[PDB]
Design a protein around this nucleic acid. Sequence first.
RNA 1: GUGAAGACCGGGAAGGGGCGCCCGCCCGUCGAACGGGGAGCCGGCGGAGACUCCGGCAGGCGCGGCCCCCGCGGAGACGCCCGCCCCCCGGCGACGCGCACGGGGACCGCGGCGGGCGGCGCCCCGGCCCGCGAACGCCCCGCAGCCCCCGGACGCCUUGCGCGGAGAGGGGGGCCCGGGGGCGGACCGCGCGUCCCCGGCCGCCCCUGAAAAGCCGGGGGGCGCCGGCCGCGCGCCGUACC
Lengths: 122, 113, 245, 86, 106, 49, 69
Amino acid sequence: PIIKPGLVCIVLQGRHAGKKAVIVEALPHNERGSYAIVAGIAALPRRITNGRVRSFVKCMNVNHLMPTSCRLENNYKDFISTQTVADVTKRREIIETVNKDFQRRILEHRDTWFFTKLPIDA
Amino acid sequence: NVHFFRPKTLVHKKAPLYPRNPIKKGSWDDPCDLLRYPIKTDENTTQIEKNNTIVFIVDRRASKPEIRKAFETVFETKVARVNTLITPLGLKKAFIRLAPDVQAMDVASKMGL
Amino acid sequence: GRRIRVQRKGAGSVFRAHVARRLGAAKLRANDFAERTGSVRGVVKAILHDRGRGAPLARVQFPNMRGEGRVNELFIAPEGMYTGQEVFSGNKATLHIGNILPVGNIPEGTYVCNVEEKPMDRGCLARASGTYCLVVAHNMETNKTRIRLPSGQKKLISSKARAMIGLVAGGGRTDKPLLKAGNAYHKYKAKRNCWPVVRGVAMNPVDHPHGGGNHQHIGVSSCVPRNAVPGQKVGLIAARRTGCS
Amino acid sequence: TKKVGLTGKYGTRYGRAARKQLLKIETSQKAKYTCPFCAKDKVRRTACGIWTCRSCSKTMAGGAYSLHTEPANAARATIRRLRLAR
Amino acid sequence: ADCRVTCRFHSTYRTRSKIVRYKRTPGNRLTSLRVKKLPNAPHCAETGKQIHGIPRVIPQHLTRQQRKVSRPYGGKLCGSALRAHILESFLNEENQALREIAAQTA
Amino acid sequence: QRVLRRLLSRYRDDEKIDRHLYETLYAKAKGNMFKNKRVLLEHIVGMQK
Amino acid sequence: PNTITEENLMKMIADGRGKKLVVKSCSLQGKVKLKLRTAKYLYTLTVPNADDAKSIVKGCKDKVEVQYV
RNA sequence: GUGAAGACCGGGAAGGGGCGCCCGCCCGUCGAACGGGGAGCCGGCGGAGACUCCGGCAGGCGCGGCCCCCGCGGAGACGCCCGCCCCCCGGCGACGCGCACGGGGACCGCGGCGGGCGGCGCCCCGGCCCGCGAACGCCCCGCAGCCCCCGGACGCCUUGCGCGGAGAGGGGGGCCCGGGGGCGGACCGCGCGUCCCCGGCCGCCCCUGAAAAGCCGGGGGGCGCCGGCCGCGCGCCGUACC
């Protein structure tokens, strides 16, 4: 049973393709098939410097993601939810919380693989 | 790199010890010399009456900006467009449309045309 | 007293190669420090057709070892090269079809194509359709190798010469009869002005040595010495023997 | 419809030997072969030596009138044995 | 009655550029209107298939949003080619990680 | 061929004929069995009975 | 030579930018063709009934030169 | 470099661009009024001129002013008010021929009605003529093709085919379509053909059917643009007639 909350995956289709993403919830398989709520990194912190990390929260189709070994323990179930994110508004605040939570993790030199970019080369 | 390239020498400015051209004189771009003669035809009388255009034979070496600036300088009246043809007989002939405010018949009368 | 057609052909007016729309000069990847030490890697991007060649060419992309781009090379395609194949090249290359290895490194009995005669020549032998060479013997005291040339002659070549594993694709091309004179017009339009071929016996004495008499005869032996001067070296040249056998 | 199946185009022309030879080669040139990669019978020839799968979408180098050739099938087999040895 | 149309170009030579469609004008006369060659849309670097989303107009007159697709490698590649390139890079790194790095451990 | 294929598809869409009957009838239409729409329609009435 | 969708858009062009010469036209007969000319394009608003057209023209004032045909 | 020269032959040469500082081996402001190319239509006006004048109506490319100022939505295919340089990686430009088959446009034809004629010894609602709508802006539709999502098959389809566990059918969607419709600019129906352009195929080759300017994506770096509005500008030569 690979798909698990706490699992890093690479988005392989969409505006966020080639970006790492951690699953906050594995959605009930429905008529639409199996989706999952993933909170990931849209834009990495910054360049070499001498600034912030943009993030995305979305219900991606599990069949558009690649399960990877990487872990991560972000509670997230406390704010990210099926009703939240689906609701327009409120979700922008959860993206802003996730942005900060990620920036904190980069500054403490934590989860280097999730915060590193996959080198797709044409 | 692996290429040896000529190494960035000074490159000076031309400094002639004597002037190559002492007196500065010449050209044909005199405003009065670019404009030659206005052409009087019954067909062209209608053109200043309806199209506000005076047709002039001009110097073949004259660009349309020059024909406009000198008509403006010599006849003291604004120009809107110049359309120019080199005539079968060798001479440039510019159709000069005076600005909508300016009335060509007045400029033609002052011209003597 | 007219210059014969062979004499005219050397001038190159009307008789040069029809090189227009030709993909390029097919050659192996040039030897570099990376190949001498180990193996580079190239994906095969396109198997294409060259205008006069009867064998397909191949566009393979190689990492730019000097800089940051991707360098594309034109390779005679060995049979079996497929789009997206990994063509390795170098002295640590493995023995698979399309890979370029130094001839000493290639085990004996291996069919090889685009072999270099002298090391670093990027291909000289075994380039036509179906043609191949064979690794015969390695002399590890002279660092030389014997290659069976496609004509069956055997040539000692340096073991540092490079060749592509496999045999040139396009095999069995000459089996099909051209059948028509038009089918042949197309073959030569892509190559050079070498057709239609007129016999000297039909021509006049001024136009050819075989020339013209009342009964279309050669009139003297076709066999001509190796040292026959320009306009005279026409017919069979330095023939060791003649006739069917 | 009888002995000259695909060589009827030529008509009563070019002689029997050429037509018989063409019937073997032309049948092989116009044939559909199995993609080594997708294992489907959709490989067809685009030009001599160039064979493209119409399902796999892969172009492979091959014999002028066959995807694979008898000398080449021998060569791959010798190369594998020799490669297994070295 | 007659609809000859004459020619609207400098030379009559009908090349691929000099093709003309015919319409009737507000003044009841037939007008040769030039039909220009439709340039092709961008085609994927691998695959060779048309990239989805970009109209077949020269990119000079196509704004910025209409000459682009919202994905990483949007115009160079189609989605399937990118989905395969991404997987190769993840899968290949992990092959060294679960082979050469696993060999360092074992 | 267009007239016969349209009638056969309409019957398959309407579920008057089964998927296998449509394909058997579709193949015999290419084989020239049915001279016209009436010939196909009569054959279907006997086929369905 | 587009159509100005809805009168408010026709009015935002009147004050913000150029309305140059408007031509209120009575034809379809009686539907009013209000042709505003701006430097870039001529925009046309057809009002179904004349009373509305006079009220639309009455909405504009000395801002745009008005012609009638 | 070579030849007594006139001259002929030619990469192995310390061969440039930014910026006051890095990058960089090395030519074509030659060659096509049929190839590539940023963008034009209608109505009028003269004895001779018009894609050129004039009136309208657009479009391209720059330049200045003035304001504004940095990503969102979708499950995905992608959709939207749109950033630039440098290096790479690409794309467009950019392409064979043929039988068919379809789809558009122009033409043609047949009716009706509305407006004009002509003939007529007999007949005649049966003859003749006219009834027009451009570039361009929007908004919507557009076969085939190509992709997405669900799901897991003896089916789906063409004139011919072809297709499917590397995902068919079915059901929902996206994209492209030299096109049509509506509204602007500003008489109605129906048909078989003709031509021309296009579409998806399929066939054919020991034949595989130009290139480059120009424009634009994408990756990485470095920077911040960009838009909206309003003005203005567009030089040189050819242009009669046969």
